[PDB]
Amino acid sequence: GVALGATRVIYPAGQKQEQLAVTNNDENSTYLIQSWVENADGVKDGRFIVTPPLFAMKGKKENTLRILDATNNQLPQDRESLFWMNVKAIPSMDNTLQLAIISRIKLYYRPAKLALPPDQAAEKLRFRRSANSLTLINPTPYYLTVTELNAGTRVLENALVPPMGESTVKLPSDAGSNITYRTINDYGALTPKMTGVME
Amino acid sequence: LPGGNMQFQGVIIAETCRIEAGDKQMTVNMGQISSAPVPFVIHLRECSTVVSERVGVAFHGVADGKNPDVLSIGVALFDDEGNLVPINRPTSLHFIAKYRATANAQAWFSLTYQ
Amino acid sequence: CRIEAGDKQMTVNMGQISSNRFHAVGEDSAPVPFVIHLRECSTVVSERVGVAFHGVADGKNPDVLSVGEGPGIATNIGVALFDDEGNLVPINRPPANWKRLYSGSTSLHFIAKYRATGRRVTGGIANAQAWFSLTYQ
Amino acid sequence: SNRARGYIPPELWDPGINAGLLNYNFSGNSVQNGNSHYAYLNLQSGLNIGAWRLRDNTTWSYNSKWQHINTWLERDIIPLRSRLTLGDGYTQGDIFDGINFRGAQLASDDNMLPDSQRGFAPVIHGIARGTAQVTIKQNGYDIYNSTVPPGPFTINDIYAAGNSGDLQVTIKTQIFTVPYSSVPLLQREGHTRYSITAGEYRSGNAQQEKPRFFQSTLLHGLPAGWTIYGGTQLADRYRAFNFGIGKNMGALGALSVDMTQANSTLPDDSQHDGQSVRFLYNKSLGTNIQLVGYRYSTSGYFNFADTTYSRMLAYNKRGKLQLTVTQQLGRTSTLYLSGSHQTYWGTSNVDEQFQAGLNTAFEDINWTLSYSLTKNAWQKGRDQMLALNVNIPFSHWLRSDSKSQWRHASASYSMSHDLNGRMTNLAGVYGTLLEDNNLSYSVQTGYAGSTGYATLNYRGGYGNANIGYSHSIKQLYYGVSGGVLAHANGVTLGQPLNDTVVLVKAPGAKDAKVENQTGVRTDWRGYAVLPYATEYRENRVALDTNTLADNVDLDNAVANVVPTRGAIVRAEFKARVGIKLLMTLTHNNKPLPFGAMVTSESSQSSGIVADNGQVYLSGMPLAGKVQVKWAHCVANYQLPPESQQQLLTQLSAECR
């Protein structure tokens, strides 16, 4: 029933607010939609305001939530920032166990002036192979997500490398030398397969 | 007579999978207590296979005072295999609800999109 | 009958379309209209015209346009053009639907939509390029 | 009793509002050699009372008079899923030849039916032994997949995939294929269309007279792919009867055959009997699309338009042949060949028209080479032309997500060779300049003599304005187009209209851009007019919160409409004006219960307490109190003078 219009949100710096679409395609159900903004570590923060924070809807209907920023330009302008956006869909009822659906997506606060292109940032990732670990290092101030991380003939768990930082994942000893990876653009589409360059 | 070149612009963006349950109202009829397996199926449709597969499933709720791993007698949830699914932990999924001796309860099925 | 100089170079924006709007092949997105103006037209020579759209046909369907290939480009999605009556016009073919002419000014309306030629829809830019030609009676 | 996918019940269609309509299009041309001024003003008046649409077209011309061109009245009949065009109009011309007329015309409308039940699609039968699910496979695509109860099942909502291929019916287990091919004259089984027409005859030619005629065409579908189409074109001195059948052979393709017999009384008071037989063959398939059309007419056969001439065009056509071959090289290149051959009676004249072309698309560059050959024995010459077109967007060199406005610009290069005369090379830059891309510059220069064409089209919230200069002869084109909608609450201006229109009503909210539109903004009063709306479908009208005023909020920014054809559909949005405030309300040093309701007294607003008693209110004054229900409470508040300046106000409120 409840559905978001995008898997991820991009908020340019200095924008007054951003719109997000929430839709429902069931004519005989009433839903109470509640929203809030979480930080990277999953802690409630007032830096962003969701309007309406909680509202009711009935039948086939779509609405737009407005995201306002009260950060007062405190986030650094040299790199992107990450936030967790949560949408809770309370089903308005009238022994029973109730279920609620909480959709969690990523919101990227992106500054105005950036040195590297968002699409070009994907192929600049660098890899390091330790005895049993793979370290992904990103020389780009853009957030990067790795998917379909193939080490030889097997895949590995996804990682979220932070900008100007490094991430570590496991690596089986029998994994092949070749490393392949995929990235997600701002549209939620998997990028074409790219070979893994070592540094 | 030749006319002129025409351009079409547009962008397509992926979105969250529509999430529902086989039982309406997002309500599971556990039944009167006296253990009792109540199966319910959660469906994730109206999206692409890649987006549907690249999700993270978690459970949240009010922890029982005695057993924090049992939702606040209490309600326990088991997967298709039959393994216990603890609460507050990091296309069709069937979950079995059971009554465990230690009545309305609410649970939060949380899906995180990578 | 000379066309308006502005109409010879026009761009039509379809906006943003949700991927799940296309469940299976054949479904269409929100329509977008566009018009073509014919001025100083003379009905003595001919009173009937047709429009032929020549462009790059898709690899899985020769009835819709092409969005190209490459990174950041939507796949299995094409651009479909329909006449004012809603009937599909096959691109890269001689005109099938014909319209009357009026002395002075004439306006022709057409509709652009997104057609799904694949089972699954991948997000991205879906830009396309085509052109129109006029066939007189 | 299953319904078609995306079905709209015949009750949500909106008749509209009793409103007026005006569409003005003024175009002036100042040609300097000269200093000659031409004006081609056009006025399209319209009225919507009840469910009737009255339309009138009148053109005023000027050179340095008024002409009532068109007038008609339309009424949609839902029970017959058709429309009656009482007044001027023209025939469809699908079976016969299209002719203008003034009279009654009751014609079935296909847009009433759902999008799934359109075009040609074979019906799928079969008895399911036990419970199972059926999947339709075509080119490795699951066209349709759903569970089917045991017993016979009928599927008749298959999308009109077109040529495509064969449909594999994978049931879960008889795996069988069904052939699929279509021509414009093929229809699904059960689907029926008719075009009953009566009244006088009119045409642009002054020599043609004005007789009274009755044209009626009926097309029907039969099981196993048969389609039977007949028609009559009865007149006082002209009797034409057409009968034909179409069949989807499948692997062979699709073939439509028809024959028309006509008795015509020429102005020479001579009776002539003639026949015309037409074949239409279509075949698909790496992929080679073949379209063949033949129309052979015996001598003495004429259309209804040929017998309307003045009392007291000589050569008659014998045969028309059309070939269309399309071959796709790779996933990028497309080559097409088209050929038209004409034969007459009593002469060897042939009007041959051949068009060959190749289209290729790079990642950004799109280039095409075309050759045209027109042979006419009237001119005793074969005109041969070669045209090369290249389109290159500026994003190829410009960096991604660049802040420059040139990112939307693109370049076009055109080369024309007659191979026996003067050549031509034209290079031009076209793009948008305004913030909402409402501007369009098309500045191009070329050599044939120097030809410079620069157009500066603009699409504002009040009307479209185009200014163009052509230098070779110094012509100046100017044009202003727009529409005026007179509704019950007043009069509004906007872009020129196209059939259905949506009037969005936002009282108090001004300058609000609408989503997915070319810079359509609300007026100072707040109303706005959408240029176009889909007929008999579910639309989506939304207001841009970014363009919304800082003191205005919308409860339901997005709405949906189902407009009838030619109906002005009014969609309203409740706009609350005031200060947006997130009040932390506490009752008896404790947060309010979750789910409690809050209703404003000074203004009309409602909200939910939510967690921690954080209630969001919009449109509130600088003071006053509200009512909280969970069990009733009141809480007065006061605001600083800078509350209006601040976008969001956060205050701690205390309950009773």
Author numbering:
A (entry chain C): 1 to 94, 101 to 205
B (entry chain I): 8 to 41, 52 to 89, 100 to 117, 129 to 140, 149 to 160
C (entry chain B): 24 to 160
D (entry chain D): 121 to 153, 157 to 187, 197 to 304, 310 to 422, 426 to 452, 476 to 611, 619 to 642, 645 to 802, ...
Question: Which statements did the authors publish about this structure?
Answer:
Uropathogenic Escherichia coli strains use filamentous type 1 pili to adhere to and invade uroepithelial cells. The pilus consists of a flexible tip fibrillum, formed by the adhesin FimH and the subunits FimG and FimF. The assembly platform FimD in the outer membrane of uropathogenic E. coli is the catalyst of type 1 pilus assembly.
To explore the structural implications of FimI-mediated termination of pilus assembly, we performed a FimD-catalyzed assembly reaction of pilus rods in vitro similar to the one for the FimDHGFAnC complex, except that excess FimICHis was also added at the end of the reaction. Given the low FimI concentrations in the periplasm (FimA:FimI ratio ≥100:1), we focused our analysis on physiological pilus complexes with a single terminal FimI subunit capped by FimCHis.
